[PDB]
Amino acid sequence: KNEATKVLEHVCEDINKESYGFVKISKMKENEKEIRLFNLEEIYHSLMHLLQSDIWVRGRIHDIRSKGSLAFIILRHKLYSMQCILDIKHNDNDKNMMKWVSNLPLESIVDIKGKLSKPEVPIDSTNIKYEAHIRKIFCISKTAKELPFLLKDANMKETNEEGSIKVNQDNRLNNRCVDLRTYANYSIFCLQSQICTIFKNFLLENNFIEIHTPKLLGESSEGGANAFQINYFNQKGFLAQSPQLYKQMCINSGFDRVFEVAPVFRAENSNTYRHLCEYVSLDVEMTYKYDYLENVHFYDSMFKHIFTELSKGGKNEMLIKTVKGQYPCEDFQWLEETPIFTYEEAIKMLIQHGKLHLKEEEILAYDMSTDMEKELGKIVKASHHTDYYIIINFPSALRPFYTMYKEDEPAISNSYDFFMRGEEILSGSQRISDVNLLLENIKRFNLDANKLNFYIDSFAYSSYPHSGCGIGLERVLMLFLGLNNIRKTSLFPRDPKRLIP
Amino acid sequence: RENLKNEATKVLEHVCEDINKESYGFVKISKMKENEKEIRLFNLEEIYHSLMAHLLQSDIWVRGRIHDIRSKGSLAFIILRHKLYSMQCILDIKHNDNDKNMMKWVSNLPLESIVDIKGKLSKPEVPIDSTNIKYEAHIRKIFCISKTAKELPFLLKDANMKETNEEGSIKVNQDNRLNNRCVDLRTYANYSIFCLQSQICTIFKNFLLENNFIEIHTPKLLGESANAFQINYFNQKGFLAQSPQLYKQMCINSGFDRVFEVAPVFRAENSNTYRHLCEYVSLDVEMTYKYDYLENVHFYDSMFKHIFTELSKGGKNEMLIKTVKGQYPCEDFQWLEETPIFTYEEAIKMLIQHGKLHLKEEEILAYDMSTDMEKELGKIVKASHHTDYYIIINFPSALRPFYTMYKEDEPAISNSYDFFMRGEEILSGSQRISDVNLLLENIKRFNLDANKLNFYIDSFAYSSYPHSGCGIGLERVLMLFLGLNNIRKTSLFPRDPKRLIP
Ligand SMILES: Nc1ncnc2c1ncn2[C@@H]1O[C@H](COP(=O)(O)OC(=O)[C@@H](N)CC(=O)O)[C@@H](O)[C@H]1O
């Protein structure tokens, strides 16, 4: 009784003299710890002369099987799986070792000493088509709690059967540290990192500098009602909904081309599949020579570049494929030359396809809904065969006060949205860069010029012609992959009903 | 009788209607078409790079801000400015059809206005020492596309001057500069400072990516933490993150192995000092280690050494640093091929042996260094090791956060570290507790509420890799690299207990 459970909980005191057991990191000094420890990613990349001799590898026990003399371990690290096997082939039939190993809880972290070789038929699961024969296995971190759900279940595509295996969004978000271990979730957030990298490097290559502007404000920035309020040492303040005012102030200071990658905070009480209370905004602001279209074409080049880099062979292709295995969706498509529609044209397309009913004099007054966004996206996919397009010339009355209107037709503005799979990823405009026109537009929008005093003032000592845009990082990733919910592309999502974890 | 002024006023306000037939005036951008075609417009950075081409054979167009105008009778001298670059442009009316109205209009342009100039570049006998473009433009046309509307709060000539005690030296004080930040940021030194800030972010990110890190973004709206700003989050009590600590650890417990984040954090402590802000940009790293946390420590070290090396090489960074030093002189930042590392005990003994610190032996383990004492240790180490950069490890466990792993041999000491630049702290970090039972025990030891940290504690319950991390102040690193006297110089729009604006 005590006998067997003593070996099930066996702690190793000398890794040389023994071949299995729980071990503190302190004790891992076989021949004075000249251990060359490998991880699955390194192994994958070199094999797909590590394999001429025994090696040490660390990983999580993704799955365990045990029958008689044989025992299979699926060892996992990030995206990489490998089958390791304990058959007591060269272990002197310890048998107690078999009991110890076969009782290890899933997700436990293990250091295996073993020999690589390629099997006749590898497992279809392990993307490492080699296997390891276990000469020694030590557990440096034992799973302490039963998982909230099994990874095999959370990794599986949803069949939607009556008695089907399905892990709820709530369950996953509540237990995010486990949810993130699925192959698709790991890949999703590697791709999020990739988008940030391509974005920054493109702008840096085009002579931009990165800026960091405050999120604690004295005023609203993108509107008062939807801002979170704070007590700032007995001043009333707000969280930034956007770095809009500061990135323009930086252009007014001469920085010429700036970007920011930073959180913003939105306090709208909206609970939708695409709305967050906190998200990462990629912001750009820059000057133009004579026409604001110069900048629009530039923003377009940027996104085409992002798509080109995300769709390339190598790592990104494996990441996207791993996402698509659980969440299938056709490849994101874009044309060599991006289609650009005017808002009027887009609305007339919706009318022509009988999705909207509007007389002429009402078109510029209609404010396009998210449903109509997706309907326009379907129309353009069928006619232009792309998932990516631009709408310009939004009605002035539907855009913020800093948007420059067309002087010859003030009912429309020099403004633009970009769309992926029919849904908005980017919003931006030519800015009003004349301080008097700016004050006129502020009063036309019934805003309080005193609360905007420092921003306005930044235009009083001249102002370059400039434009800019703001982009949702989580939206871009969501829509590139076709995912159903933006909570899949934010690490720890924030929404009106979720502050935790 | 004297209505002639009315005419003069018409001249000073002249709006140009056709740039093909006129040589000066205010213009709409929509009217800058030369013979119905598009102007090839240059900026001063392009000119600087080319000349220091097609620029010397014919008239060109250049845009810039009027940094200065000097009127001298039939000549006027305009200094045009863009970024770090300036160029002298000359209007001589003998060459401009003896048109006195044009001269009158040019002289009356306010500083900082934005103009497009059409003219011919040539190299003068001896160039103006203030302009780093050593060519001059001789003006054939000049059009103003944005006129300064308001008297400046202070003059840029004064805001650019190095501070001295010489007679009639005008200083622009901090309160004034910060209040009119969009003007202050136009000084050459301030422009250069924030280019160097961007440079630090780029080098940090690129180093970590080349070493197989991924960038993460973790929430700043939190549910639970008294140095935190509070928020009402839809009838919940929320707080602003002081640090992404818990989430970057949670990511390591999720398998991400190597993560960094560049993001704001928010600190509500009521402290007004030269080096403390209420909002700043934190550079955070968190990563696993094989068997010894010192692996990661040496990695963080090479990261900073790499940053220093990249900041100190090449034309661009060299000119940015030289431009800062022209206004704010300071010895070049110094470091060693082997970074010195001291234990906390060692550092304390050094301070005591040098007469800078007196303590009872009993109080040696509880002592917490002041910032003045930080600078004193910095002076000692500068004199003995000839470096501005060094590391302290092995702080007492009682002085470090609850997630800090202590030495199991001697639990009073922890596996923690700070890095120092010019004697002042830039980085804080440690080996983490990665055993969930030890974590619960330490949380109990610090009289913390486990319920408030549940989601975090739970993330250690399904195994935890051995790991460590660090947090870095971006503005502090830049300030101490340049030797600047105040962190408000290295934060674009500073936040402190008495400054919410701009
Ligand atoms: N609640 C939200 N949750 C998640 N993502 C969101 C959310 N709201 C917006 N986005 C993303 O940010 C982009 C720009 O935001 P806007 O509010 O349209 O514009 C702005 O904030 C202007 N300052 C832009 C500019 O003119 O520079 C959107 O296209 C979308 O991808």
Ligand SMILES: Nc1ncnc2c1ncn2[C@@H]1O[C@H](COP(=O)(O)OC(=O)[C@@H](N)CC(=O)O)[C@@H](O)[C@H]1O
């Ligand atoms: N008020 C401030 N204003 C400007 N910069 C500041 C301010 N406070 C700190 N810093 C910078 O951040 C680094 C680490 O922050 P700490 O609070 O020491 O540690 C932390 O935040 C831990 N979570 C780090 C970790 O262990 O990961 C400092 O060295 C300094 O450069």
